Structure formats: C-alpha cells, structure tokens
Amino acid sequence: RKQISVRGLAGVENVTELKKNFNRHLHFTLVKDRNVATPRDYYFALAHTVRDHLVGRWIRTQQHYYEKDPKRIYYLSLEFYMGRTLQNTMVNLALENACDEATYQLGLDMEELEEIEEDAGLGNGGLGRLAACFLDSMATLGLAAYGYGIRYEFGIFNQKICGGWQMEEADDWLRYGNPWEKARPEFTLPVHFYGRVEHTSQGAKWVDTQVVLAMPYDTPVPGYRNNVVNTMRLWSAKAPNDFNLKDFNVGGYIQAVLDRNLAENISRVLYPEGKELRLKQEYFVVAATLQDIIRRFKSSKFGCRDPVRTNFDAFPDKVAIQLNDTHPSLAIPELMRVLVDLERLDWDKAWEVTVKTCAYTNHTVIPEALERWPVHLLETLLPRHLQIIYEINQRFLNRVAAAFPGDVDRLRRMSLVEEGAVKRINMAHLCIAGSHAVNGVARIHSEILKKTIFKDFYELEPHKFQNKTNGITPRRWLVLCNPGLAEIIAERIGEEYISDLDQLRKLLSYVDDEAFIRDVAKVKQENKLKFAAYLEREYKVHINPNSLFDVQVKRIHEYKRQLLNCLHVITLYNRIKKEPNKFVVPRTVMIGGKAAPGYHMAKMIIKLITAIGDVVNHDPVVGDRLRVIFLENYRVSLAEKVIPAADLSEQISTAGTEASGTGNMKFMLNGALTIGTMDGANVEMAEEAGEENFFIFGMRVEDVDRLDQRGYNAQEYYDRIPELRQIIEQLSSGFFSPKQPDLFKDIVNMLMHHDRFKVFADYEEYVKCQERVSALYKNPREWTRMVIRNIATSGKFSSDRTIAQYAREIWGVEPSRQRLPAP
C-alpha cells in the first residue's frame, strides 16, 4: 500500500535510458511512429522526456512542504511571461547535452527541435517577464513560492510587419497542446458574479449570483540545480456546463448562451480602464487563487490542526500574498469577505490578518495612470465588495483623523473614493491600506512614492515603504542567451556566480589583459554572425556582421522615444550622403516591440521606421554604410538572442518617465554599452558601473520638471539646429514615401507642436554623444575594455538578489542555496 513511491522512474544522466524515454513517449503518449512522426512530434516527445525528469522532483518538493510546513508565499499577477521551457528545464536540471547526445545518437538535432516550441504566451512585457524571472529565483533560493495568474488560450497577438504596418495576427500558442502543463478537473472551484447582498442576524449574504468555473493548470518552474521544483497554478474559466436548459432558465429564450462566451472568454485574451471584462478577469484570478490559499492553510496540515478553531491567528505566519501591481487588489476585499462572512471573524480581527498577509509591488512613476474603478462597475458585479471597500475606508480615514485632527483636505487626498465626474475607487490606495508593505521598483522611484505620489501615506505609516531594485536572471539571461560568453568566465571565477552574483566583480582585475580583449570580441563577432545569420534565415536583410550593432527593443510608445532614434538615423543617412565619401562607422540599428491596438502614433512610428528601410538600404549610394532593421514580433525567445549581438543598448526615454527598467540589466551583461537619458534603472546601473563606463546623455528628471514652467516649445530648435531643420523638411516632403508625402504629417505636428516627451529637446545632446559612441567603436579594443567593466559590476541587477530582499524584509522567510537530495 506504501509501495506506490517515487523510486525508479529514470536513469537520469543516462543517454541511453532517456533514449528509452524519447521512444516511450512517441509511441505510447503521442501515438506516432518514425514513418509518420513530424519535427513537432519529436519536440513533443523530447518535451515529455525532460518533463518526467522534472515532475519526479516536483513530487518530493511538494512532499517536503507538507512535512516541513513553510510560509507559503503566493505571488499574484495577471501576466506571466515564460516563453520556451525545454532548454530551461534542461539546464536547471542538468540534462541538456545529455539530451543532446540521445537526440543525435537518435539522429535528430536538439537545437532544430527546440525551435518548434511556441513561446508560453502569458505576457506582453516587463510585468510578466519580471515575475517570470522572480519565479526562477524563488525556486532557486529554497522558497515556497507559488505563482498564480490566468491561462490564456491566445495570450496577446502575434505581430506581422506588412506593407510597413503591424497586423495583429493572433497567437493560438496552445492549439497543438502544451507539454509542460497539467490540467486539474478535480480542483475546480466556482467564481460567483453579479448577485446581491442580503444581511442577516450575524452577517450578510451575497445571493442571486451568476457563476464561472475556475479550473487550475499546473506548469512547474524548477529551481536551479538544487532539486526543488514549484507550481505555477494558472486558472481557466469553464462556463457552468449544466447548459442546454438546467434551471429551466433558457425555457423562454436560449440567449443566456451569451453567458457562455462572455464568461468563458475571461480566459482567452490578455490586454495590450473602462472594461467590465478587465475587472471580471481581475476578480476571477483573485477569487479562485484565494480559495486555494485557504485550502492549503486549513486542509493541508491545519485540516486537522486547530488550536484557535483553525483560526487565522496563524494565517499570516503561514501565508503571504504579494500583489504584483494594482491588478490583484481585490485580494483585500475578497480575503476580508471570506474571513468575516464565510467563517465569521470579527471585522477588526479579520482585518488584523488581512494586512499582515498582504503587501504590494508598485510600478508607476505616474499618478494619473494608477488603477481606479467606477463604483457603478463595482456595485453591480461586486456588491459585498463595493460595500466592504466603503467600510474599510471610513475605518481607515478615522485612523487618519486621529493622526491629523482638523486637516480636512487630507480626508479627500487619502480617500478611497474619488469624487465628481464619476466617483471612482482608487485601487492603489486600497492596496496601501491592507498591505503591510509597498515597494518601489527602483531606488529613485521609491523616493518618488514618498516625496510625490503617496506623500500622505508615507507621513502616516512611514515604514510601509520599502524598496526592492528589480533584477534579471542569470540562468535565462546569460547561460541560455549568451553561452559563448558564459564559456569564457566560468573557469576564471568559479561557477558559484550563477546563484551568488556580484562575484562577477572579480573579472574587473581581468580587464587589462590583452587575452580577455581579443577573447570577447570573438563572442561578439561570432554572435553578430550567428544573429546576423538568423536575421536572414527567418525573414531576410543583407547585413555587415562587423557593423556598430545598435539596438532599442521596447514598446513602440511615445515616451520611450523610437522617434529620437529615427531623427538621428536620418542625420546619419543624410550626412554620409552629403559628402558621399564622408567615412563614419556603419551601424545596423534594430528597433522593435509590438505597439498596442488603437494607437496610431505607435502605428505611425512603425511605419516611419518601415519607410526609411526602403530608401536607406535601397539607396545604393549608402551601400552598407547604414542599416535599420525593425524586429517583427520581438518577444522572450527574441529577447534571449538579440541581447547576444548587443553592442549598443539604446534605452533613450525622457527623464523621469520610466519607473525602472528590466530589459536594460540583461543588456549590460551580455556585453552591451547602455547609452541613455538618466532615470529609472539606467541610474543604479551607472552608480554601479561608473558614469564613465556608461554613456548617459541628455536631460534629467529635474530640468524636465523645470521646462514646463517657463514654456517648452520644440520649434525654436527648428529654427536653430540646421540638420533637424533638414530631416523635418525631408520627413515632410514625401522623401521616404513619394506615394503618400503627407503620411508622417501627423507625426511632424506631434513632434513640433505637442511633444510631451521633448524628443527635439534631447536631439543635439544625443548626437554629440553618439559621435562619442561611433568614434570610440573604431578604437576597436578600448571599446572591448569597458564592455568588461560593465559585466563585472553585475550582482545587484540579478533577481536572486531581489528575491533575497523581498524574502528578508517583507516576507520574513530566510532564503536557501542548499541542494535538496534525490531527484
């Protein structure tokens, strides 16, 4: 009876007894054979093999925390950007080149198979990709972290450059199935919606509700090489499949069928403010999750164990809910609703635990883009919750009054309920009220949630504000992505670095050495040949390799400045042309990110970049003196192979607009010079690397704040800076497009007359700087010099670090670097 144990299921490190497993699954799982099986079949066969070799470990980890009962720390997020599991299972488990030998002794090619894998489309950018990284490093740091979010049938679109434009051609990543996940029909809970309250003797009822079933799916995330492998648990919406008539509800009219789609497509599309669905989605992910959070606190070990009627006195000891951004916020009104209403905890006692369990990571530098909801939206889907939100509030605000008698303008600046032309609830204030700890994403930024945006909140509970300077992850962002460069490091410092990281600091001593100089430009010249290969293979281009390899891969969006780039690269096309022999360093510039539907300036700016392309790379006057590639469909699998041929990381956003920056850290690692306007995280990177090692141009936070106080007007620069007069002219007189001359005319007036982001004011400073970048390119080795002093610097911009910080001052729980036995 006890003979159903984890014993024997594989022979690990054996090329041959996993060569017995690639066969096992092709036949018995996939029901295919060698005369009929396809590439995508042998990737699904390989996918399964490394997977039994994951879920072995997953049983015993999972076993461990029942016995050992840690504080289970759930990270709540509506975006989870993983993106290609196979290789990353292989390294954090070991089996990679022991999977390479089997799959060539078999006669395949594990790298050709690897590219059959669609990206696990649960994201869009850095809110998913941060947590996707924190999921790797919590798993490595011994921590009992659970990641819970929603499983999107389609994620967010796949982009398509056609005619120069973006066509958002949808991503059905999951149609051929997904190796890595397990469905769990057995642990389906309901999500109730709409309904109404109805009070009784002891509490209140929220009867009359519509329901949407919550079905869980388990991807696992391995910890790096210490054998603990954790659970992502992502929800799927099932419409109640009582339907055809039961309740006799359709009777007189079927059209409640419109429930089936408007409920069930909670789970089909991720977004790219004013939407019942974004809130329905939001309430979906927190309800199901928190019901599961309560069943491991009771059932799994406290099922039996009480003391205090298995009260929640020991809840905050055992559980910690970390709301990433404002999208989990209904975790405070829903947690309060279950403890008070379903169990029967005092409003006061239940709110005790609530704040103690919860804390909230803050991502915006802007107060204007900070989630708030309409009360008519609340009150109708969520009545009890519009009611508990009202009640948390005067309770909070009287606590404010105790600490500020008579200061009336604060009971409307602290308030939960916004007023006037649509009374809204400010969700970020709701969070700060029930979260014992808020953190800024960068140092600077935590200051500006003290000094500017939650000033009152920091005056009254001074201490909730923490800082955790968000990093990246060695495994993904050095080892998978640039292994030639993780090759030449290993043996010098000791592999202790990938899970203990400012040790990168040693290679600093190694700078001078003219071995390391010639060493590294190979990685970068090989990389710039392999990526300059891939370029022409998928899609196609005609490139240098050797070029200055210049890249900026962000969202196409005004305040990140793809535009500043475009002006400059029209200075470059035009001066090199003017004197056609005017030698300068030939750059291949790559701009790329998706836009966001119903964003025409961010549709326009793709089109200017795909208007240039034509006249530069096809004006064979220029030849290979200048090239601008647009990266169609930039996502996490492209993220790990363009930072790779990063000479130049152009992170050129207006000062004080970026709240931080993550795809900038995994750039001064791979060997990339970061040239950009100072704010966000372009800062601490230079406070580490030294300003002289960086290339910080242009304005700053402080003199930008100056500028819109004595009038900012971009023209004035139009009348002075003679080449910008040139490029504005040629921009406007159908140079790029003879067929539609006017075309970039909506962008001219934008650039001229209502430029919120001062693209023209940071022009000149940018060019008498990217002259310092070009002229230094062709000083081919003291170029290669600084590219080491950036690498050495690293360990703060590593998410292991950040997780230890969250671990330690906010959660409690002490980290680990120990290897759990077996597999």
Give the active site residues: 363, 554-555, 560, 662, 666
User: Which of these ranges, 241-249, 520-528, 603-611, 628-636, lies near its own copies under the rule CB under 8 A?
Assistant: 241-249
With CB under 8 A as the contact rule, which of the stretches 60-68, 144-152, 397-405, 791-799 interacts with its own copies? 60-68
Considering the rule CB under 8 A, would residue 821 count as an interface residue with its own copies? Answer: no
> Is position 202 an interface residue for its own copies (rule: CB under 8 A)?
no
Which residues 6+ apart lie within 8 Å of 510 measured at CB? 492, 516, 788
Stretch that binds its own copies, among 47-55, 372-380, 492-500, 571-579 (CB under 8 A): 47-55
Q: Could you say which of 192, 225, 268, 450 contacts its own copies (CB under 8 A)?
A: 268
Residue 248 touching its own copies (CB under 8 A): no
Query: Does the protein bind its own copies through residue 304 (CB under 8 A)?
Result: no
Stretch that binds its own copies, among 6-14, 205-213, 443-451, 797-805 (CB under 8 A): 6-14
The upper half-sphere exposure of residue 593, i.e. CA atoms within 13 Å in the direction of its Cβ, equals: 20
189 binds its own copies (CB under 8 A): no
Find the binder of its own copies among 177, 303, 367, 780 (CB under 8 A): 177
**Least distance CB 54 / its own copies (angstroms):** 9
Selected from 4, 304, 308, 402, the binder of its own copies by CB under 8 A is 4
Closest CB to its own copies among residues 266, 485: 266
Distances (CA, A) of 658 to 285, 341, 428, 445, 651: 28, 42, 18, 9, 10
* Cα 168 to Cα 58, 157, 250, 272, 644, distances in angstroms: 37, 5, 37, 11, 27
Lookup: tokens for 785: 């010099």
Other Cβ atoms less than 10 A from the Cβ of 816: the count is 15
Residue 69 binds its own copies, judged by CB under 8 A? no
| Least CB distance to its own copies at residue 110 (A) | 14
| 44 near its own copies (CB under 8 A) | no
Q: Does 52 bind its own copies (CB under 8 A)?
A: yes
What phi and psi values does residue 723 have, to the nearest 5 degrees? -75, -40
Residues in the chain, overall count: 823
Which residue type, as a one-letter code, is found at position 739?
A: K
Residue 584 binding its own copies, by CB under 8 A: no
| List 39, 111, 115, 176, residue binding its own copies (CB under 8 A) | 176
Place of tokens 């990217």: 770
Q: How far is the CB of 343 from its own copies (least distance, A)?
A: 25
Q: Of 742, 720, 746, whose CA–CA distance to 732 is shortest?
A: 742
End-to-end CA distance of the chain: 22
> Residue 24 interacts with its own copies (CB under 8 A)?
yes
505 binds its own copies (CB under 8 A): no
Kindly tell me which residue out of 162, 257, 342, 775 binds its own copies, with binding defined by CB under 8 A.
Answer: 257
Cα angle value 250/253/256 (rounded, 5°): 60
- How far apart are CB 1 and its own copies at their closest, in Å? 3
Which of 64, 192, 225, 260 lies at the binding interface for its own copies (CB under 8 A)?
260
The single residue among 13, 31, 303, 413 that binds its own copies, judged by CB under 8 A, is 31
Say whether residue 539 binds its own copies (CB under 8 A): no
Q: Which two tokens stand for residue 741?
A: 């001359």
**Residues 454/431, Cβ–Cβ less than 8 Å:** no
**Which residue matches tokens 């390391």?**
516
Q: What is the distance between the alpha carbons of residues 79 and 129, in angstroms, rounded to a whole number?
A: 8
Task: Give the integer Cα–Cα distance in Å for 729 and 721.
Answer: 13
Token duo for residue 584? 């300068």
Q: Are 613 and 588 in contact (CB under 8 A)?
A: no
Q: For residue 765, what are its two tokens?
A: 């400073």
| 8 A C-beta contact, residue 406 and residue 454 | no
- 3-state class (DSSP) for residue 362: strand
Residue in 5, 200, 201, 581 binding its own copies, rule: CB under 8 A: 5
Q: Which is nearer to its own copies, 35 or 201 (CB)?
A: 35
Burial string for 513-536 (b: 16+ CB within 10 Å, else e) reads eeebbebbbebbeebbeebbeebe
Among 13, 111, 115, 172, binds its own copies (CB under 8 A): 172
* 33 makes contact with its own copies (CB under 8 A): yes
Q: Where are the alpha helices (DSSP H) in 407-463?
A: 427-434, 443-447, 455-460
Binding status of residue 222 toward its own copies by CB under 8 A: no
Rule CB under 8 A: choose which of 15, 18, 26, 127 binds its own copies.
26
* Cα(357)–Cα(668) distance, integer angstroms: 36
Whose tokens are 């690692």? That residue is 669
Alpha-carbon distance 609 to 586, whole Å? 18
Taking CB under 8 A as the binding criterion, the range among 261-269, 408-416, 622-630, 729-737 that sits at the site for its own copies is: 261-269
Token pair 């002891």 in the structure block, residue: 202
**CB closer to its own copies out of 24 and 700:** 24
182 binds its own copies (CB under 8 A): yes
| SS3 assignment, position 331 | helix
- Cβ neighbours around 109 below 10 Å, total: 14
Nearer to its own copies, 260 or 575 (CB): 260
Binding of its own copies by 27 (CB under 8 A): yes
Q: Which stretch binds its own copies (CB under 8 A): 30-38, 654-662, 704-712, 717-725?
A: 30-38
Nearer to its own copies, 4 or 421 (CB): 4
Q: Does 244 bind its own copies (CB under 8 A)?
A: yes
- Minimum distance between the CB of residue 38 and its own copies, rounded to whole angstroms? 8
Burial 448-478 (b: 16+ CB within 10 A, else e): bbbeebbebbbebbeebbbbbbbbbbbbbbb
* Contact between 258 and its own copies per CB under 8 A: yes
Candidate segments 105-113, 406-414, 471-479, 575-583, binder of its own copies by CB under 8 A: 105-113
CB of 4 to its own copies, least distance (A): 5
CB of 189 to its own copies, least distance (A): 15
Closest CA to 170 of 150, 156, 188: 156
304 marked as binding residue: yes
Is-contact 74 145, C-beta < 8 A? yes
33 assigned binding-site residue = yes
**Under rule CB under 8 A, residue 22 binds its own copies:** yes
Question: Whole-number minimum distance, CB 24 to its own copies, in Å?
Answer: 6
**5 vs 581, beta carbon nearer its own copies:** 5
Of 168-176, 420-428, 507-515, 700-708, which segment contacts its own copies by CB under 8 A? 168-176
Cβ atoms 19, 106 nearer than 8 A: yes
Nearest-angstrom CA–CA distance, 85 and 221: 9
Strands 358-362 and 372-374: what pairing?
Answer: unpaired
The Cα–Cα gap between 809 and 818 comes to 21
How many residues touch its own copies under the rule CB under 8 A: the total is 60
Q: CB 397 → its own copies: shortest distance, Å?
A: 43
6 near its own copies (CB under 8 A): yes
For the packed helices 15-24 and 39-68, what is the interaxial angle rounded to 10 degrees?
A: 110
Min CB(273)–its own copies separation in Å: 16
Binding site, by residue number, is 33, 66, 295-304
User: Which residues of the shown chain bind its own copies in the complex (CB under 8 A)?
Assistant: 1-9, 19-20, 22-24, 26-29, 31, 33-35, 37-38, 40, 51-52, 55-56, 58-59, 62-63, 66, 105-107, 154, 168, 170, 172, 175-177, 182-183, 185-186, 218, 241-242, 244-246, 257-258, 260-261, 268-269
Binding site for AMP, by residue number, is 33, 66, 295-304
